[model samples]
Target chain A: PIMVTVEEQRSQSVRPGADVTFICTAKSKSPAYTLVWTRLHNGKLPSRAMDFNGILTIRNVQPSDAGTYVCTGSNMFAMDQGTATLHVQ
Target chain B: TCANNRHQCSVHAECRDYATGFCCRCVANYTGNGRQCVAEGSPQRVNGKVKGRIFVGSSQVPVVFENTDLHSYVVMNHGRSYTAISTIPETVGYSLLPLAPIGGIIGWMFAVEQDGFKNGFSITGGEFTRQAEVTFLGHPGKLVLKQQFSGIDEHGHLTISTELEGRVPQIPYGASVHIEPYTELYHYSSSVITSSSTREYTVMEPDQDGAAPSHTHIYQWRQTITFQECAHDDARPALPSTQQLSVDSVFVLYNKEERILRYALSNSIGPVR
Candidate 1:
């Protein structure tokens, strides 16, 4: 069975009130894999954050929003994920 | 002789000029006959090792840092109490979970204290964890340091704090710390081009009564590894390629006195699909 592969997301460091976007793209032979974005630890994304088409955008990112975000791509065959860290100063 | 730079004393020795000649004496922390000086303690290489366990939640995992992995340096020497610091490479990874396979980049600044004949040490500083792709015990997994998690304060604001835990044996005195710098290169089969960039920040105090705020420039060096593909098979490159970009940021923290306090680096790489 073929496995799904997702691109790694690079971590970011930005000041408060800045906008941040993380684009997560995945590839699979079945073409039926699903992409989901969630923060680590708390397992919940910030209320001001939006995930659309595997692209996560956080507007006016705050220091409280700093943490690790995981982008998971899964299908019937296999599941894989990538992570990105956000450092707010 | 001292003013004329004609003294033949060792670099670690202080030269004192006399009426007819110059005298040399080894500086602090080092001792010798003035002509040739050596650090206090054994002149030969000292073997230092760290063996202990770290608690991750309810599980306890044993960790070890042998002489090969540790670089020991004497920090203080007073009577029978010998204090030293041991540093390991940043590439080392530890498993935070016992049952589930996970890899996390964990670092510790171990301070070894040897009093009399008994060995004792503590994790003085440099306890940091970050999410990364690492291989641990022949298994590969994505793991994040548990201490990196933040908690909500009473005012509903995110409060970040890091608490370190662990223990190790003592490091030998007069041991010199040695570090080897490394660099990594990534290659892509297709027509991919990579670029780099950087960013910096300066933390400042809030203005008081219109007085200029004192600023502490916290400089950080970042290298962006962005990959761009060819526009077409044979056509010349035209517009900006909307390809995926991955950045590896390495931040080095310096205090107001321009002393480097900490340094960290992280990388993310994936195949083009």
Candidate 2:
């Protein structure tokens, strides 16, 4: 069996009062994929965030902006997940 | 490096690049890359953007930022369009900013490069070469340098950290700059002149083998920070948050070369309401 290696822009936790900007770069041979941003709550499913040119910004960031953030890129058939963590101040 | 100076800018401009110490660009009012001059028609250098989260628009938004550096626009379009902006050079050396005369005796606002100043260059000093702009707005609302970046990387230039501020010269009261379209924000509190003068100096490290002679200018137009007026007499600002509502944030400047002056009105409404 052949193996697929993955790389990510890495997740981060933003401070409760600080301003934050994030970038999610997905590494895959196929560029035909949608990049999605989501927030995780208590190990539950994630919620969506804004996505633009592979970069995301969270302004007036708060403790709620902190958590496990996920970037999922897919082409309807196959999907890949990228996760980043944010720590609040 | 005045009388002893030998080099000068291209035919379009009469200045040189800051880093290289060579007359390198066209003067303001005159346009063309560093090599030539073309008559300008409108305010130039404009840009804009809106911000939010990845999937959801955060109700608690980060401040949206924008820049024209110089030019004003016709429609708000949320601050886009640059009928008159010069493209930035790949390198900062030997740049030229023309010293064009403002067509009318109305107010004008300009944006100059920060490094040139920190490196010791003056706005409109006619020393090291660099380009600057005076954008006119459409619909008669004057210019406002309100755009700031607290969100995603817009130019990634990291201007806030570097103190990359823009500057312009100002005319005295009774003196006036022209009015362009998109001009809002009446000159309620254009700074009254308390003290002013025309002086010049070399902003670069002294003994650079060839730096301009040091001088201070009250020559280029000068006006102290005076109170400004709101566009409408009864306009309101973001209340409760008094900072956004105070007229204290408004500013106006007099540009000597262009013989024009401009004002920067805070985007928020104010006590005048």
Best by TM-score, which number?
1
Model 2 lDDT, residue B134, Cα: 30
TM-score of 1: 0.24
lDDT of 2 at B130: 15
Model 2 accuracy (lDDT, Cα): 0.28
Cα lDDT tens digits, model 2, B26-138, are 47765332322333432222222212111111222222222312332211111111111122121210111111122111112222112211001111111111111232212
Q: Residue B69, candidate 2: how far off, in angstroms?
A: 40
- Residue B217 error for model 2, in Å? 43
- The parts of candidate 1 lying over 4 Å away from their true place are A1-9, B1-273
Q: Per-residue alpha-carbon lDDT of model 1 for B103-170, expressed as tens digits?
A: 01111111112221111111101112222222222222222222231221233221222222232121
Per-residue lDDT of candidate 1, residues A1-89 (tens digit): 23323345467889999999888866654322345567773264676776644567899989999988877664334556788889998
What's the residue-level lDDT of B136 in candidate 2? 24
State the DockQ of every prediction: 0.01, 0.01
